[PDB]
Amino acid sequence: HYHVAAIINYLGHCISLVALLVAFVLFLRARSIRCLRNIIHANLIAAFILRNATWFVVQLTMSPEVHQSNVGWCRLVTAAYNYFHVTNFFWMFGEGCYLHTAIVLTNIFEMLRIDEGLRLKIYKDTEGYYTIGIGHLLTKSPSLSVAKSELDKAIGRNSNGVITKDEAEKLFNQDVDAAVRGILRNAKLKPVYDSLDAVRRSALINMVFQMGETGVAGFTNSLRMLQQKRWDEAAVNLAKSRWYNQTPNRAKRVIATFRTGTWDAYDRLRAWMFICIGWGVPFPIIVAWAIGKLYYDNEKCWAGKRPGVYTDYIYQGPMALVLLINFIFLFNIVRILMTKLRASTTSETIQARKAVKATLVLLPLLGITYMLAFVNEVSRVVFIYFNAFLESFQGFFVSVFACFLNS
Ligand SMILES: CCCCCCCC/C=C\CCCCCCCC(=O)OC[C@H](O)CO
Numbered sequence: 178h179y180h181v182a183a184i185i186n187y188l189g190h191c192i193s194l195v196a197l198l199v200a201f202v203l204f205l206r207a208r209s210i211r212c213l214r215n216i217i218h219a220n221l222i223a224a225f226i227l228r229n230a231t232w233f234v235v236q237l238t239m240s241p242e243v244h245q246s247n248v249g250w251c252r253l254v255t256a257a258y259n260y261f262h263v264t265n266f267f268w269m270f271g272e273g274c275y276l277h278t279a280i281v282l283t284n285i286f287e288m289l290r291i292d293e294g295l296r297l298k299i300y301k302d303t304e305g306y307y308t309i310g311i312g313h314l315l316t317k318s319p320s321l322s323v324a325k326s327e328l329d330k331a332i333g334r335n336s337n338g339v340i341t342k343d344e345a346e347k348l349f350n351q352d353v354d355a356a357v358r359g360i361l362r363n364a365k366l367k368p369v370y371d372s373l374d375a376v377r378r379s380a381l382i383n384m385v386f387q388m389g390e391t392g393v394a395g396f397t398n399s400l401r402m403l404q405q406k407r408w409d410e411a412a413v414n415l416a417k418s419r420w421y422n423q424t425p426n427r428a429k430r431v432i433a434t435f436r437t438g439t440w441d442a443y444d445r446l447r448a449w450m451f452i453c454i455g456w457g458v459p460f461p462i463i464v465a466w467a468i469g470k471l472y473y474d475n476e477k478c479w480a481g482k483r484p485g486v487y488t489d490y491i492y493q494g495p496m497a498l499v500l501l502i503n504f505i506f507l508f509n510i511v512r513i514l515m516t517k518l519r520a521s522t523t524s525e526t527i528q529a530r531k532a533v534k535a536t537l538v539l540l541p542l543l544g545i546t547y548m549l550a551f552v553n554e555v556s557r558v559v560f561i562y563f564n565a566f567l568e569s570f571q572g573f574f575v576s577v578f579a580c581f582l583n584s
């Protein structure tokens with residue numbers, strides 16, 4: 178049977194590798210590779226591709242004579258293969274951070290957290306008025322004691338000076354409504370705002386926060402063009418204003434949002450933070466593991482299982498912890514979907530459901546294999562053959578899954 182299990186493993190690994198590669202090319206071709214969803218999926222696929230390819234290399238290490246010798250390149254392959262193992266876990270954790278944040282925090286919140294900055298503690302602004310969050314003014318009393326109270330009425334609860342991230346969102350949402358009220362009352366801004374789609378409306382609100390209604394109104398020809406959906410020409414005119422000269426970066430992002438329609442400008446910035454979770458963090462982990470092996474376990478290409486001293490827990494450790502956290506995220510996401518978002522049916526909530534549905538489908542497929550790992554008749558043959566199939570086709574499931582989310 179052992180030969181059968183080996184044949185299935187090579188067959189599966191081939192299939193999953195091809196599947197992953199096809200999915201990756203798909204995501205690269207897409208114009209949506211700009212979206213944050215697709216950046217994570219593509220990186221997730223890459224992380225998976227690398228592991229499958231390394232598997233075939235690892236197969237060469239296996240032959241006894243190389244296994245025994247513990248050659249230098251042998252050790253590199255084992256470490257590399259393990260690195261990609263952690264990469265897989267952390268990228269999956271990547272998707273889970275995104276999904277969780279996707280429901281709890283709106284796009285417009287994220288845009289103006291990059292552009293004006295988020296401060297969770299009470300601070301005094303430039304002219305000395307107490308301000309918290311994304312540019313929210315509490316009151317103009319000189320006594321911070323009074324300010325703590327003013328925040329409490331706003332939030333509903335006693336604050337002691339420091340508000341939760343979810344609370345800042347409520348403050349921010351309030352400000353956005355105020356901005357819209359102002360926009361609708363403005364004779365110049367109103368026709369333009371009403372014609373714009375949701376993403377561009379956000380970009381208009383961005384300028385309102387920085388310049389004011391009166392300031393944004395001053396852009397007569399840019400807004401005319403905006404209204405006539407002449408986005409390329411509208412962008413040209415927006416630069417010429419000195420707003421651009423004084424704050425190029427924020428202006429470029431806001432202007433670019435007018436052109437495209439998308440969040441691409443802000444999404445790139447967000448993506449670097451995911452990148453660290455997926456490739457950045459597992460690298461110190463694997464380095465620490467490799468030192469451990471050099472110190473007490475220099476045998477057998479680093480793949481020897483010795484009972485022994487636990488060195489594999491240096492990388493296995495974080496893999497386990499990352500998983501638990503994802504469960505906590507999932508637990509919170511599912512509850513939110515029942516709790517507030519039953520009746521919502523927005524563009525975001527539909528996708529989040531579709532994702533959660535797919536996660537639930539994905540999670541037993543990958544999970545059973547670990548369950549079978551802890552616990553060890555014709556039915557014994559069925560255990561091994563099942564194992565051989567699940568591990569080998571692990572990659573294929575990921576390819577299908579990523580594609581399903583993208584759709
Ligand atoms: C010796 C090696 C140590 C090196 C340490 C590496 C970590 C530092 C990395 C980034 C710093 C620069 C980040 C600048 C990018 C910020 C972009 C942005 O958000 O800001 C736009 C601007 O605020 C609106 O005008």
Ligand SMILES: CCCCCCCC/C=C\CCCCCCCC(=O)OC[C@H](O)CO
Pocket residue numbers: 192195196199200203204207576577579580581583584
């Ligand atoms: C046939 C024998 C040789 C073995 C070869 C293995 C066969 C499965 C491999 C590829 C399927 C990948 C799944 C693709 C799912 C298509 C649905 C999809 O969403 O496509 C659009 C894409 O997401 C836009 O970004």
Ligand SMILES: CCC(CC)Nc1cc(C)nc(Oc2c(C)cc(C)cc2C)c1C
Pocket residue numbers: 265266267269270272273274276499500503504506507536539540543544547
């Ligand atoms: C378990 C072994 C591992 C091997 C790759 N698979 C993983 C790893 C991780 C971290 N999360 C997974 O799923 C989730 C969970 C649990 C929560 C959320 C919010 C999102 C996703 C995609 C799977 C299927």
